[PDB]
Curated annotation (Swiss-Prot), chain A:
Component of the Mediator complex, a coactivator involved in the regulated transcription of nearly all RNA polymerase II-dependent genes. Mediator functions as a bridge to convey information from gene-specific regulatory proteins to the basal RNA polymerase II transcription machinery. Mediator is recruited to promoters by direct interactions with regulatory proteins and serves as a scaffold for the assembly of a functional preinitiation complex with RNA polymerase II and the general transcription factors. It comes from Homo sapiens. One of its GO terms (cellular component) is nucleoplasm. Belongs to the Mediator complex subunit 28 family. This is Mediator of RNA polymerase II transcription subunit 28. Its main location: nucleus.
Swiss-Prot record, chain B:
Component of the Mediator complex, a coactivator involved in the regulated transcription of nearly all RNA polymerase II-dependent genes. Mediator functions as a bridge to convey information from gene-specific regulatory proteins to the basal RNA polymerase II transcription machinery. Mediator is recruited to promoters by direct interactions with regulatory proteins and serves as a scaffold for the assembly of a functional preinitiation complex with RNA polymerase II and the general transcription factors. Required for cholesterol-dependent gene regulation. This is Mediator of RNA polymerase II transcription subunit 15. Component of the Mediator complex, which is composed of MED1, MED4, MED6, MED7, MED8, MED9, MED10, MED11, MED12, MED13, MED13L, MED14, MED15, MED16, MED17, MED18, MED19, MED20, MED21, MED22, MED23, MED24, MED25, MED26, MED27, MED29, MED30, MED31, CCNC, CDK8 and CDC2L6/CDK11. The MED12, MED13, CCNC and CDK8 subunits form a distinct module termed the CDK8 module. Mediator containing the CDK8 module is less active than Mediator lacking this module in supporting transcriptional activation. Belongs to the Mediator complex subunit 15 family. It comes from Homo sapiens.
Curated annotation (Swiss-Prot), chain C:
This is Mediator of RNA polymerase II transcription subunit 17. The chain holds residues 408 to 651 of 651 of the full protein. Coiled coil: none annotated. Interacts with GATA1 and PPARG. Component of the Mediator complex, which is composed of MED1, MED4, MED6, MED7, MED8, MED9, MED10, MED11, MED12, MED13, MED13L, MED14, MED15, MED16, MED17, MED18, MED19, MED20, MED21, MED22, MED23, MED24, MED25, MED26, MED27, MED29, MED30, MED31, CCNC, CDK8 and CDC2L6/CDK11. The MED12, MED13, CCNC and CDK8 subunits form a distinct module termed the CDK8 module. Mediator containing the CDK8 module is less active than Mediator lacking this module in supporting transcriptional activation. Component of the Mediator complex, a coactivator involved in the regulated transcription of nearly all RNA polymerase II-dependent genes. Mediator functions as a bridge to convey information from gene-specific regulatory proteins to the basal RNA polymerase II transcription machinery. Mediator is recruited to promoters by direct interactions with regulatory proteins and serves as a scaffold for the assembly of a functional preinitiation complex with RNA polymerase II and the general transcription factors. Belongs to the Mediator complex subunit 17 family. Ubiquitous. It is found in: Nucleus.
Swiss-Prot record, chain G:
This is Mediator of RNA polymerase II transcription subunit 30. Belongs to the Mediator complex subunit 30 family. It comes from Homo sapiens (Human). Its main location: nucleus. GO terms for biological process: positive regulation of DNA-templated transcription; positive regulation of transcription elongation by RNA polymerase II; positive regulation of transcription initiation by RNA polymerase II; protein ubiquitination; RNA polymerase II preinitiation complex assembly; somatic stem cell population maintenance. Expressed in brain, heart, kidney, liver, lung, pancreas, placenta and skeletal muscle. Residues 34-58, 84-121 form a coiled coil. Transmembrane segments: none annotated. Component of the Mediator complex, which is composed of MED1, MED4, MED6, MED7, MED8, MED9, MED10, MED11, MED12, MED13, MED13L, MED14, MED15, MED16, MED17, MED18, MED19, MED20, MED21, MED22, MED23, MED24, MED25, MED26, MED27, MED29, MED30, MED31, CCNC, CDK8 and CDC2L6/CDK11. The MED12, MED13, CCNC and CDK8 subunits form a distinct module termed the CDK8 module. Mediator containing the CDK8 module is less active than Mediator lacking this module in supporting transcriptional activation. The keyword Transcription regulation applies. It is found in: Nucleus. GO terms for molecular function: nuclear thyroid hormone receptor binding; nuclear vitamin D receptor binding; transcription coactivator activity; transcription coregulator activity; ubiquitin protein ligase activity.
Length: 102, 156, 244, 391, 255, 115, 126
C-alpha cells in the first residue's frame, strides 16, 4: 500500500536506533534496516522502470520529444564551450602577439 | 579426569541398574528445582527431479508396454531437436536405489539395422557407453546418445 | 662511473653513441604511430556508437613516447559502467596496453590489431554493463564468464557470458555478446506459464510446475531505448512485479 | 620439435601442446595439432588430442584455450563429489548453450537429525545446481530450491511455493579451485540448514495451537533457510535471530531493535547467555517466545536503574540486583505477570551471611510496596517499576 | 590499557560459561538415559553426553585460571555513551550504504597549486618511510619523486591534483636528479612489471569528484611495496599487491 | 584489589567444584545402594544441595568483581579520551549538550517528515 | 509528458538514497563554528529530503491517476519474441549535429597537433 509510505517508514527505522531516549546489536540492526531500505528502493526503481517501459511501448512520442530536447541542450552546451574556447584563444593570441617583439 | 573423576566413577558404576534414573532423579531433583526454580515454560523422487531438470529436447515418459512395476523403471523418452529423431525410444531400465547400479540400456538391434546411418549411430553410441565412467546417470546416457547422433551426422 | 665501479653495459655500454639520422627516424616513426592510433580511435568513435568510446591524451609527451586514457562507458549509465579502462603507451614501434584487470598486452603498429582489440574490449564491456546493472537492480547473478568456450567458434575476440535471475524467483535472463556474433539474449520463462511445453505422465505432482522452464529467446531488434543498457533495464522492468 | 606449451595459469598442472607440421601439397601453409597434457623433474601423466570442431588470430587456438580454461575447473569438483560418495550428474551443457553445471541428485542425509525431518527435507529439495563465476573463474555458487515452505514472513516472500537460496564459496588462492574444503563447507551449511529446519517444522506444527498471547506478541519476519528473524514487542520493535554455527555446533541467537518505538537496546541483552544455553539445551522456539513475553516487562524496569546498583545476570528468570556490594536482591519472574523479590545476601539455608553479607535491615518496605526473608512476591509489574526508585 | 579491557570481558564470559556448564552436567543427569532404539546405543549416548559435559566444565575452569594471569555528572557519561554509539552506528551505516549505491547517472580543471602542495605535504607527513620531493620543472603540472626505503624510487607525474603517469625505478638507479627524467625505463624487468602494476593501480583507484583520497590510496598501496624480496606470494614459489588487501602475489600466479 | 580478589576466589572456586563433585558422587552411591539391594552406613553424608548453592554463590561474587572492574576500566579509558578545571568540565558539558541538541533536532525532524 | 514524469520519479527515487547516504556520512563526520555549519547542513539536507518525498509522492499520484486508454495489455505479453514531420525534424537536427561534430573533430585534431608539436619542441630544446 503506497510503497512510498513503506520506504519512508524504513528510512525512519534506519534512524530509529540512535534517535531514542554492544557492537553486535547495532551491527545487526543496521544490517536489517539498510538491507530493507535497499530492497524497497530497488523495488520502487523497478516500478518506475515498468511504467517507463509501458509508456514507451504504447506512447512512443514523448520519448521522441525527450530526445529532441536532449539534442538541443547538447548543441547549446557545445556552442557555449566553443565560445569559451574562442575567447581563451583570442586572449592568448593577443598575449603572444604582445611578446615575440624586441 | 581431574576434579570430576568420582562422579564419573559413580555413574560408571551404576549403568544397567534398572532403578538407576530414579536414584539420580531423587538426589538431583530438589536442589536444582530449588535453585533454578520451576521447569520449562511410486516413482522415486530422485528420478522425478532428474526428469524435471532435463533439457527440453527430451520428452521422457513411463513404459506400460513391457513387464514393469515389479523390477526397474522402464522409460521410452524421445529425441526432439534440430538434430535427428532416429529411433526415439532408447528403452532405459533404471533400477531401484538409483545412487548405485547404473541403469542399463536394453539393446534393440532390430531397428538400428537395415540402415547405414542407424548402424553408425548404434556403433558410436555403444562405444561411448563403453567409454562412459562407472555409476553413470540417466542424463549422461541421454547426452551421450545425443552427441553420438551428432557425431554420426558430422561423419556422413 | 669508473671510480664507483660501473657495470659493463649498465651506466656505460656505448655512453651516448647514436646518429642524427637514427634519432630523427625514431622520432618520425613515433609521430606516425601516434597519428595512426589517433585516426583509428576517431573512426572507432564515429563508426561504433553503441557502447561508447573516450580518450584523454596526456599533457606532457616525449619524442619517443606518448600516452592516452581509453574508457568504454555506456551512454546513460556512466557511473556504474566503469569496469573497463585502458592506458595505451604509444612507443616508437610498439603500443603497450595496460588493462584495469592487471593485463598487459604488447600490440603492433598495424591498425587491424588495435581495431580488433578495441572491438573485443567493447564486447566485454557490453557484458560487464549487464553485470553492473544486475548488481544495482538487485537481480541475483547466477553465472558470469569473461571468456566462454561453449558455442560457435568466434572472431578476433572471445565471447562473453552472463546469466542473472529475477529477485522474485521464477524469471531469469541470459546474455552472450561477441565481436562477430553478439546480443544473443534469451529469457527463462517459468513452467506452467508457456502452456506449450509437452507434459509428461511421470510428473504426477503440481510442485514441479514452478521451476524456470522453456527458455524463450527475445529479439534484441525492434526494441525501445537507445543503448544496450536502456533495453536491458526496460527488459528487467518488464520482468519485474507489476506495482502499477 | 616445433611445439608450443601453453600453460593454464588459473588451473595449474594442465598444459596444452600445440605442434606445427608442414603440409606437403602447399609449401606455404602449416597444420596445427592440439594435445591436452598434464604434469604432476616434471612428470607427465596423460596425453589426449582434440581433433574435431586478417588471418593471424588463429581462432581455433584461442577457442580451445578458453574451452579448456572454462571446463577443467569442473573436473576437480566432479572428482571431489565422486570421492565423498555424493551422487551427482556429470558436467552438462546448460539450456542457455554456453555453460557448465553439476546438478546434484541426493545429498548425504545428515548426522544428528531425526528421520522424519530428513524425509521432509529430502522431499523438498528440488535442485542443487552448482555453477562457476567470478574473476579468475574460482567462485562457486549452489542454488538450492525448496518447495512447501513451512511459514512465510512479513517481507515479500509469500510468492509461489519455490524459495531459492544461493550459497557462494570462494576457495583460497592456493588449494586449487577443485578441492575438498568447498564441498565440506557446503555440507556444513546443509547440516545447519537441517538443524534449523527442525525448529521451523516444530514452529509450523505449533502455529495452529497458540496460547493466543504470543500470536499478537510475536511475529515471523524472514525465512532465508539459514536464519530465523522473529520480532516481538508491543510495537513490533525488538527482534531475535536464530542461526546454527557449525564451527561451534551450537545455536547462535542475535538480538536487535528494528522498529520506530523502543529504548536504547533490545532490553534483553542482560540475559543473552542464559537464553543461549536455554535454547541450546531444549531447541524449542515457543518456550523462547513465552519466556521473552514473561521477562520483558521486568527487564524494562530493571534496565533503567542507575548504573551503585549492579546487575548480576544469574540463571534465566533469576536476575540479581545489588546496591553497592553490601546489599543484594533476587528477581524471580514467573508466569501471569508476577515477580518474587528476596532479601538477597540472605541464604536459603542455615542462617549464615554470604561473602557480601550485610543483611538488609528494613525488609518490610517490600511488604508496604504491595527471618522474614522467605518470599516477597505478588508484584504485578507496577511495583516492579515503582519499587525500583523506592528501594 | 585496551588489552586489559578485553581480558576482563573474556573472563566475564568464562565465569558465565563455567556456571552454565556445571548446571548442564547436573540438569542432563536428572533427565537420565533415553530409549535410543538399542541397548548399546542408549548406554553409549548417555556416556558420551556426560563426558562432553564433564570436559566442558574442566575446559571452562582452566580458562578462568589462565585468564587470571593475563588480567549533572551522569548526563556527561550519557552524552559520552551516545557519542560512541552514534559514531559506531553512522560508520556501519555509511559503509553498508556506500558499498551498495543506487546512483546510475550524473545528469538528472582549475585548481590552486598551493592546495596541491598542501595535500602532498599532508600525505608526506604520514608514512614516515616514504619521502616525496615536490618539483615543477614543466608548468603547473607537478612531478613527484617518491623514495621508498632503499627499495623504490617512483616518478609520479601530476597534471593536476590527479595522477597521470608513474615510472618506478631502483634505488641504485639514477633518476638524473635534474632537468627530472620523466621518460625512461628501469632496465630491470621486475621494476618494469612494478610500473605496469602501478599504472594498473592508478586505473583502479579513480574516485570521481574527490581528488585527495585517490592519492592517499595510491601512496598507501605504494607503501606496501616495502617488503619486496622478503615476502611470499601466498599461492606461489618464492610483484603484485592486491587492492583492498595488501597481500603479495606473483603476476604469473594470479592477480 | 579487583585483580587481587579474582586471584583470591579462584583457589576457593576450584575447592568448591571438588567438594560438589565428591558430595554428588557420595549421594548418588548411597541412593543407588538404598534403591538396589546394598547395605550402606547412614554417616554424615553432607547434602548435595548445600554444596551446589555454595558454588553458585562463589560464581556470583567472581562475576560481580569482574563486571565492576571492566566497567571501572572502560569509564577510565573513555574519560582520558574526552586552564582551570571548572571551565574544563563546563566546556565538556557544553559540547555534550550541543551534540544532544543536534541529536534531538535530527530525531524530531526525521520523525515529523514521515511517521 | 507522462513518460517524462516517470523518468522524474525514477531520478527522485535514485537521488533520495544518495541524500540519505550523505546524511549518514555527515552524522559520521560529526565528532562532538564548525558545529553550526554541520547543523545547518543537516537541516538543509532534511528539508530537501522532505521536498523530495513530496515530489516523488505527487509524481506517483500523477502516474497512477493517468492510466491512459492504451494499457489493456498486461506485462509479459509485450516483449517481442522470435516466434511524419517529427522524423523530418529529427533528420534535420541529425544532419546539423553531424556537420558540427565533423567541424569539432577537425578542431580537436588541430589542437592535438598543436599540443604535440609544442611538447616535442619544448622537450627537444633541452
Amino acid at each position: 500500500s503506497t510503497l512510498v509510505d513503506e520506504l519512508e517508514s524504513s528510512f525512519e527505522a534506519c534512524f530509529a536506533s540512535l534517535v531514542s531516549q554492544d557492537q553486535e546489536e547495532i551491527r545487526t540492526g543496521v544490517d536489517q534496516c539498510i538491507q530493507k531500505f535497499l530492497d524497497i528502493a530497488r523495488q520502487t526503481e523497478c516500478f518506475f522502470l515498468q511504467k517507463r517501459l509501458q509508456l514507451s511501448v504504447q506512447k512512443p512520442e514523448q520519448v521522441i520529444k525527450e530526445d529532441v530536447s536532449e539534442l538541443r541542450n547538447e548543441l547549446q552546451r557545445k556552442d557555449a564551450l566553443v565560445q569559451k574556447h574562442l575567447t581563451k584563444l583570442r586572449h592568448w593570441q593577443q598575449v603572444l602577439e604582445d611578446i615575440n617583439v624586441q | 579426569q581431574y576434579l570430576c573423576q568420582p562422579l564419573l566413577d559413580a555413574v560408571l558404576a551404576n549403568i544397567r541398574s534398572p532403578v538407576f534414573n530414579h536414584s539420580l532423579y531423587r538426589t538431583f531433583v530438589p536442589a536444582m528445582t530449588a535453585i533454578h526454580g520451576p521447569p520449562i515454560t511410486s516413482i522415486p523422487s530422485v528420478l522425478q527431479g532428474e526428469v524435471a531438470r532435463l533439457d527440453p529436447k527430451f520428452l521422457v515418459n513411463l513404459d506400460p508396454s513391457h513387464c514393469s512395476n515389479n523390477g526397474t523403471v522402464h522409460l521410452i523418452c524421445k529425441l526432439d531437436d534440430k538434430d535427428l529423431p532416429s529411433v526415439p525410444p532408447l528403452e532405459l531400465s533404471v533400477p531401484a536405489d538409483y545412487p548405485a547400479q547404473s541403469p542399463l540400456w536394453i539393446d534393440r538391434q532390430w531397428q538400428y539395422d537395415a540402415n547405414p546411418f542407424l548402424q553408425s549411430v548404434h556403433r558410436c553410441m555403444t562405444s561411448r557407453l563403453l567409454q562412459l565412467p562407472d555409476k553413470h546417470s540417466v542424463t549422461a546416457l541421454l547426452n551421450t546418445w545425443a552427441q553420438s547422433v551428432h557425431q554420426a551426422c558430422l561423419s556422413a | 662511473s669508473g671510480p664507483q665501479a660501473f657495470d659493463k653495459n649498465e651506466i656505460n655500454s656505448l655512453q651516448s653513441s647514436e646518429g642524427l639520422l637514427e634519432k630523427i627516424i625514431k622520432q618520425a616513426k613515433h609521430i606516425f604511430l601516434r597519428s595512426r592510433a589517433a585516426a583509428t580511435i576517431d573512426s572507432l568513435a564515429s563508426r561504433i556508437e553503441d557502447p561508447q568510446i573516450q580518450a584523454h591524451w596526456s599533457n606532457i609527451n616525449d619524442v619517443y613516447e606518448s600516452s592516452v586514457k581509453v574508457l568504454i562507458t555506456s551512454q546513460g549509465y556512466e557511473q556504474i559502467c566503469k569496469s573497463i579502462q585502458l592506458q595505451l603507451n604509444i612507443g616508437v614501434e610498439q603500443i603497450r596496453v595496460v588493462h584495469r584487470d592487471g593485463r598487459v598486452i604488447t600490440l603492433s603498429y598495424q591498425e587491424q590489431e588495435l581495431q580488433d582489440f578495441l572491438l573485443s574490449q567493447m564486447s566485454q564491456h557490453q557484458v560487464h554493463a549487464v553485470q553492473q546493472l544486475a548488481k544495482v537492480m538487485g537481480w541475483q547473478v547466477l553465472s558470469f564468464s569473461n571468456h566462454v568456450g561453449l558455442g560457435p567458434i568466434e572472431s578476433i575476440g572471445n565471447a562473453s557470458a552472463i546469466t542473472v535471475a529475477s529477485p522474485s524467483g521464477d524469471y531469469a535472463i541470459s546474455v552472450r555478446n561477441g565481436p562477430e556474433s553478439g546480443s544473443k539474449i534469451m529469457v527463462q520463462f517459468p513452467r506452467n506459464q508457456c502452456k506449450d511445453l509437452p507434459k509428461s505422465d511421470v510428473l504426477q505432482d503440481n510442485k514441479w510446475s514452478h521451476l524456470r522452464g522453456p527458455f524463450k529467446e527475445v529479439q534484441w531488434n525492434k526494441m525501445e531505448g537507445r543503448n544496450f543498457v536502456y533495453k536491458m533495464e526496460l527488459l528487467m522492468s518488464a520482468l519485474s512485479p507489476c506495482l502499477l | 620439435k616445433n611445439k608450443l606449451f601453453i600453460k593454464l595459469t588459473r588451473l595449474p598442472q594442465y598444459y596444452i601442446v600445440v605442434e606445427m607440421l608442414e603440409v606437403p601439397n602447399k609449401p606455404t601453409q602449416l597444420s596445427y595439432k592440439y594435445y591436452f597434457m598434464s604434469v604432476n623433474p616434471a612428470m607427465a601423466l596423460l596425453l589426449q588430442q582434440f581433433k574435431e570442431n586478417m588471418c593471424a588470430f588463429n581462432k581455433v587456438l584461442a577457442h580451445f584455450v578458453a574451452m579448456c580454461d572454462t571446463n577443467m575447473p569442473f573436473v576437480g569438483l566432479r572428482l571431489e563429489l565422486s570421492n565423498l560418495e555424493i551422487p551427482h550428474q556429470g558436467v552438462q551443457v546448460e539450456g542457455d548453450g554456453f555453460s557448465h553445471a553439476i546438478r546434484l541428485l541426493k545429498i548425504p542425509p545428515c548426522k544428528g537429525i531425526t528421520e522424519e525431518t530428513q524425509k521432509a527435507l529430502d522431499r523438498s529439495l528440488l535442485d542443487c545446481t552448482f555453477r562457476l563465476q567470478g574473476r579468475n573463474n574460482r567462485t562457486w555458487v549452489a542454488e538450492l530450491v525448496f518447495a512447501n515452505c513451512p511459514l512465510n514472513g512479513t517481507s515479500t516472500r509469500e510468492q509461489g511455493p519455490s524459495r531459492h537460496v544461493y550459497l557462494t564459496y570462494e576457495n583460497l588462492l592456493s588449494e586449487p579451485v577443485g578441492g575438498r574444503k568447498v564441498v565440506e563447507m557446503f555440507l556444513n551449511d546443509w547440516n545447519s540448514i537441517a538443524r534449523l529446519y527442525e525448529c521451523v517444522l516444530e514452529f509450523a506444527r505449533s502455529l495452529p495451537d497458540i496460547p493466543a498471547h504470543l500470536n499478537i506478541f510475536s511475529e515471523v519476519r524472514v525465512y532465508n533457510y539459514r536464519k530465523l528473524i522473529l520480532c516481538y514487542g508491543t510495537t513490533k520493535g525488538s527482534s531475535i535471530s536464530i542461526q546454527w554455527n557449525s564451527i561451534h555446533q551450537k545455536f547462535h541467537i542475535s538480538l536487535g531493535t528494528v522498529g520506530p518505538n523502543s529504548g536504547c537496546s533490545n532490553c534483553h541483552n542482560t540475559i543473552l547467555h542464559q537464553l543461549q544455553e536455554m535454547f541450546n539445551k531444549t531447541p524449542n522456539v515457543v518456550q523462547l517466545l513465552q519466556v521473552l513475553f514473561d521477562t520483558q516487562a521486568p527487564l524494562n524496569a530493571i534496565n533503567k536503574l542507575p548504573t551503585c546498583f549492579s546487575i548480576l545476570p544469574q540463571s534465566s528468570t533469576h536476575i540479581r540486583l545489588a546496591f553497592r556490594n553490601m546489599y543484594c536482591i533476587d528477581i524471580y519472574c514467573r508466569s501471569r505477570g508476577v515477580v518474587a523479590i528476596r532479601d538477597g545476601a540472605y541464604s536459603l539455608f542455615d542462617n549464615s551471611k554470604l561473602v557480601e553479607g550485610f543483611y538488609p535491615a528494613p525488609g518490610l518496605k517490600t511488604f508496604l510496596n504491595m527471618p522474614g526473608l522467605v518470599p516477597g512476591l505478588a508484584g504485578s509489574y507496577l511495583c516492579s517499576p515503582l519499587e525500583r526508585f523506592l528501594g | 590499557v585496551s588489552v586489559n579491557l578485553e581480558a576482563f570481558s573474556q573472563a566475564i564470559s568464562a565465569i558465565q560459561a563455567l556456571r552454565s556448564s556445571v548446571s548442564r552436567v547436573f540438569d542432563c543427569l536428572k533427565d537420565g538415559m533415553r530409549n535410543k532404539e538399542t541397548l548399546e546405543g542408549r548406554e553409549k549416548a548417555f556416556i558420551a553426553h556426560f563426558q562432553d559435559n564433564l570436559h566442558s566444565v574442566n575446559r571452562d575452569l582452566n580458562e578462568l585460571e589462565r585468564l587470571s594471569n593475563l588480567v549533572l555528572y551522569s548526563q556527561l557519561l550519557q552524552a559520552y555513551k551516545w557519542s560512541n554509539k552514534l559514531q559506531y552506528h553512522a560508520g556501519l551505516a555509511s559503509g553498508l550504504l556506500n558499498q551498495q549505491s543506487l546512483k546510475r547517472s550524473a545528469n538528472q580543471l582549475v585548481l590552486p597549486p598551493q592546495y596541491v602542495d598542501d595535500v602532498i605535504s599532508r600525505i608526506d607527513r604520514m608514512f614516515p618511510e616514504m619521502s616525496i620531493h615536490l618539483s615543477r620543472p614543466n608548468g603547473t603540472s607537478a612531478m613527484l619523486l617518491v623514495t621508498l626505503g632503499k627499495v623504490l624510487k617512483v616518478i609520479v607525474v601530476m597534471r593536476s591534483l590527479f595522477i597521470d603517469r608513474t615510472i618506478v625505478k631502483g634505488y641504485n638507479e639514477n633518476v638524473y636528479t635534474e632537468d627530472l627524467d620523466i621518460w625512461s625505463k628501469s632496465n630491470y624487468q621486475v621494476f618494469q612489471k612494478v610500473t605496469d602494476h602501478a599504472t594498473t593501480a592508478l586505473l583502479h583507484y579513480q574516485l570521481p569528484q574527490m581528488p585527495d583520497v585517490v592519492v592517499r590510496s595510491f601512496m598507501t598501496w605504494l607503501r606496501s611495496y616495502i617488503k619486496l624480496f622478503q615476502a611470499p606470494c601466498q599461492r606461489c614459489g618464492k610483484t603484485w599487491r592486491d587492492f583492498r588487501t595488501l597481500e603479495a602475489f606473483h603476476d604469473t600466479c594470479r592477480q | 584489589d579487583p585483580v587481587q580478589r579474582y586471584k583470591m576466589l579462584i583457589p576457593q572456586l576450584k575447592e568448591s567444584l571438588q567438594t560438589l563433585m565428591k558430595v554428588a558422587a557420595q549421594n548418588l552411591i548411597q541412593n543407588t545402594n538404598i534403591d538396589n539391594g546394598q547395605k550402606s552406613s547412614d554417616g554424615p553424608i553432607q547434602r548435595f544441595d548445600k554444596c551446589l548453592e555454595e558454588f553458585y554463590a562463589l560464581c556470583d561474587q567472581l562475576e560481580l568483581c569482574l563486571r565492576l572492574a571492566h566497567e571501572c576500566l572502560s569509564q577510565s579509558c573513555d574519560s582520558a579520551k574526552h586552564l582551570p578545571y571548572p571551565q574544563y568540565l563546563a566546556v565538556i558539558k557544553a559540547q555534550i549538550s550541543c551534540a544532544k541538541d543536534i541529536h534531538t533536532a535530527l530525531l524530531d525532524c526525521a520523525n515529523k517528515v514521515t511517521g | 509528458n507522462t513518460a517524462s514524469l516517470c523518468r522524474i520519479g525514477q531520478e527522485t527515487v535514485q537521488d533520495i538514497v544518495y541524500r540519505t547516504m550523505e546524511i549518514f556520512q555527515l552524522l559520521r563526520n560529526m565528532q562532538l563554528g564548525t558545529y553550526q555549519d554541520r547543523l545547518t547542513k543537516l537541516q538543509d539536507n532534511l528539508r530537501q529530503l522532505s521536498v523530495l518525498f513530496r515530489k516523488l509522492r505527487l509524481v506517483y499520484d500523477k502516474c497512477n491517476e493517468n492510466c491512459g486508454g492504451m494499457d489493456p495489455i498486461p506485462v509479459e505479453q509485450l516483449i517481442p519474441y522470435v516466434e511524419s514531420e517529427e522524423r523530418r525534424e529529427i533528420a534535420e537536427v541529425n544532419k546539423k549535429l553531424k556537420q558540427k561534430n565533423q567541424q569539432l573533430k577537425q578542431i580537436m585534431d588541430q589542437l592535438r597537433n598543436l599540443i604535440w608539436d609544442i611538447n616535442a619542441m619544448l622537450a627537444m630544446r633541452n
